[PDB]
Amino acid sequence: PGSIDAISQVINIAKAHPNFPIALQWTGGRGGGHHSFEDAHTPMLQMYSKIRRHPNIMLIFGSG
């Protein structure tokens, strides 16, 4: 994911199969190569609680 909506999408793929490991690699806008107009903290700061109510989501911070 790279968007707040994108994250929310992953959360849905998560409910999809609650027993399956999903590595949500939250990248930021300050990464290398491909980009994003997005801040690295805001999205995560904002989605964290919801991301965390799904045990199958392995939250991984990247970029910078």
Added chain:
Amino acid sequence: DVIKGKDFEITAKEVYDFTHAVGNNCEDFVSRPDRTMLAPMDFAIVVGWRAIIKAIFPNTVDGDLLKLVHLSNGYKMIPGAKPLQVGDVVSTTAVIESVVNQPTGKIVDVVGTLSRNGKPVMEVTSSFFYRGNYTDFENTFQKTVEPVYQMHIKTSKDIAVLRSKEWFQLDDEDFDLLNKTLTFETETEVTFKNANIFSSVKCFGPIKVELPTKETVEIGIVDYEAGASHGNPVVDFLKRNGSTLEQKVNLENPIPIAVLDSYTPSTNEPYARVSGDLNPIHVSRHFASYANLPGTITHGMFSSASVRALIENWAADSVSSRVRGYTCQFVDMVLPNTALKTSIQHVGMINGRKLIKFETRNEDDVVVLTGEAEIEQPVTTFVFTGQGSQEQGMGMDLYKTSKAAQDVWNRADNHFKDTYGFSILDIVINNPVNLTIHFGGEKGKRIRENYSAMIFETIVDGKLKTEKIFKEINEHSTSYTFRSEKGLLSATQFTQPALTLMEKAAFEDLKSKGLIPADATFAGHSLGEYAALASLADVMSIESLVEVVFYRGMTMQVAVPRDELGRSNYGMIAINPGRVAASFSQEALQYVVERVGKRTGWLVEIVNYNVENQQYVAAGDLRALDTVTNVLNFIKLQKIDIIELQKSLSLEEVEGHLFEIIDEASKKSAVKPRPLKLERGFACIPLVGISVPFHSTYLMNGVKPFKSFLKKNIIKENVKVARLAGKYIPNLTAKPFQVTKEYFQDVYDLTGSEPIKEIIDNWEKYEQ
């Protein structure tokens, strides 16, 4: 006999009680911190009730008070009077206007006049009805205020017929009625003696004549008197032989405002207590039942104040101040706990106020209430446009539809034809490339002298250098010719009349539709200030206007030395301090222009201060304009914050700093050909057309010849002070016209004028 009431102090709490009784939750009446409490115009009835109701009591007006009926009641605010306040002490006076025996019963029309501090504040109107069969005729009488009749004395027999009537009685019998317009403001007082036959008929009022200003002056009297009459001859005459001026003017289509839901109170005691109407009919079932009513009828007065509140809220946007007139017809009765959809539309105009009509029906869909209200327009200000935007055919559409328009144009077009030999309508209608006047027969020669007397005076060091405006027109000239490669509509001597005319016409149509607010403020931009003064203050005739304005243009055309091809040594530049730099302020443009003024010893001054930090206009020496336009271009590409360099360096330091910048650009334009062609800038635009540095100090010598021209056209008697005081914003001063020592001084300061200086100096000419 007049009925005197009682003095009445409005307590803060009498208001609380009344508002809450009728259910008026307007904030103007609720005690708020740092505001005086206002009293509802409805409250007038609480004050006058005892003075008014007394009027139906005398023995000569014998009625069965238990069969009494309220027909109507209204309040009219006398103009200029502020609304009732919590502080006020109020004297009430109830005169009983008309008491007439009708087929069905006796009718009494009462008038209240609530005064405050000597002055009258508002009028209250109530009419009551004693039902029954009356022969009381000896105690019956009727006064009515006849509408104003206008009469256009066109012919010689017309004036003959009028002198034929004994009631037509003017001051100087020698008055030249021929070709004037008369108005007849009549009141007719009648007393009955029989069923249909009048006992006596009085009919009096002033006769007035229209002035060029369209003001009306008393010329004489209507004075009719007759016993054993049968009809009113005077009114009949004026009806058939005149037109009836009604001050109301409908809109095109009624405009719906809102449909609201109302309710009558559970009990009537609350209203009765605040109002002083202890009439048992409304409160005691056994009295209601004895009078054969449907029950304990709701106070017709409640519905009056209840509905009024709705009008107040939704039509006046809850600005108590705005409603200045309300009136109410009690169509049918209402019991307590009835629901009332009352609807409100905007129906027309009267004297700048919105005419509003309403109708209230009940649950059975029966009309119970109907009245109208006059409500003030939002604060209005009129600004009159100056030259530059004139288009061919401008406002010619309105000439085709509006009568007001035609009269304005035609009066003017005629004056122009008969004194200068051209049609301003033509020039406007089809922009003519050229136009020759021909000094034909006896009338041709009359015309040319009016051309020959065009003078441009120039007081230079005591000396008065006067020249003919029209050099060439002389005793041997057969014609003159105005020229313009584009079209004469854009040559100021015609442009100005055209503009003034279009505007004055348009405003007089608005005035005719009753759309001009009384307290509106006005201002004009250069030229438009004459149109503004004419439109709102009628300071001059329609002809006087086009005259002054036309000479003002001939004057401008001649005050500047000209070429062979008639070229100008001057011009105007329109600046935008914003475009130079976001840093470049007003003091910055002033500063810069004042330096390039002093430095080059040329002429640049700021002429138009139009929009702060955005639109300015400077005039003067074409060379000085080419410097400023370039000095400016430099400071922009240079990014020179002068507000910052003023802090860091000294006055003399930055002074010299741009004195250098000036001197490198000033060399460049002095070395340019004869009548330098101003070119565009980054924040400078040349005003194509203009050739005179007007609204600079340059035109200071051409003042006193115009200052006489104006005095010969703006007569003392047409300057009504109130039309200007506080409403008129000049251009010299930018402060609302006041005839005060204070104001007079500011004018001297901005101008230095003899007539003024003496006046300031000996202001104590106070006493006649």
Added chain:
Amino acid sequence: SILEDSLENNEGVPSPMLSISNLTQEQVQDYVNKTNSHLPAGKQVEISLVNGAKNLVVSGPPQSLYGLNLTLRKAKAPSGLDQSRIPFSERKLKFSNRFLPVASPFHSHLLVPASDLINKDLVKNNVSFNAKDIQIPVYDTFDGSDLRVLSGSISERIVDCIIRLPVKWETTTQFKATHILDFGPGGASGLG
């Protein structure tokens, strides 16, 4: 006219308490300080509730709160602006604001007058709260403190705490606990 406009601009039906969301307490106070600049004492609006982080509640006369509402209306941005292709820093403030369901300006200078009068009344009936009698901490709305550790009248405090003083909700919920029980009005739209 106001009610009309406030309605076609998706704001509430003008009342004495406006609630602004996603603005700094500092940010909010800024706009109000501006609005209040142009008004007389008796018409001014203040922060009533600091319900949370970027959640606040301004309060005053409805009309002057409507004025604040207008100054705000220009500073914001259409909700579906899609600033996803705009660099983060460069984007525009998106934020919510609406009038609240209440007839009176609580916690504002408008009510200070009724303060002394209410207390004078509370005495003329049996009512008072002795710190001896309260059995469990009652956290002060402003302090976050206990109302028992109080020199003067506990009654008089909670009167002035509802009528004049702001509610620093997070600081007044200083305590630590496993569980909070909401007995107050309004299901899931309520304080809990």
Added chain:
Amino acid sequence: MKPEVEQELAHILLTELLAYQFASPVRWIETQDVFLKDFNTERVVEIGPSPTLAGMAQRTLKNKYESYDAALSLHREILCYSKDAKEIYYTPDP
């Protein structure tokens, strides 16, 4: 002050203002501020061929009355006789 006297005076003041207006500059910025702020006009109507003084008073509002207007909840309406007939004569569509 005596009415006739007031006239006589007010008259010459009026004629003075008009005569010298010729030379002195046009203080329109100060003027607009008089009726915009001192008077708080809600309907400023321009009577002319095109809307020039209007867009003038419009810019002035954005440039200076941005905040004043908002707080004081005053809706201002700027109308040119040229283009805004409907709104001046109170005659709309449906």
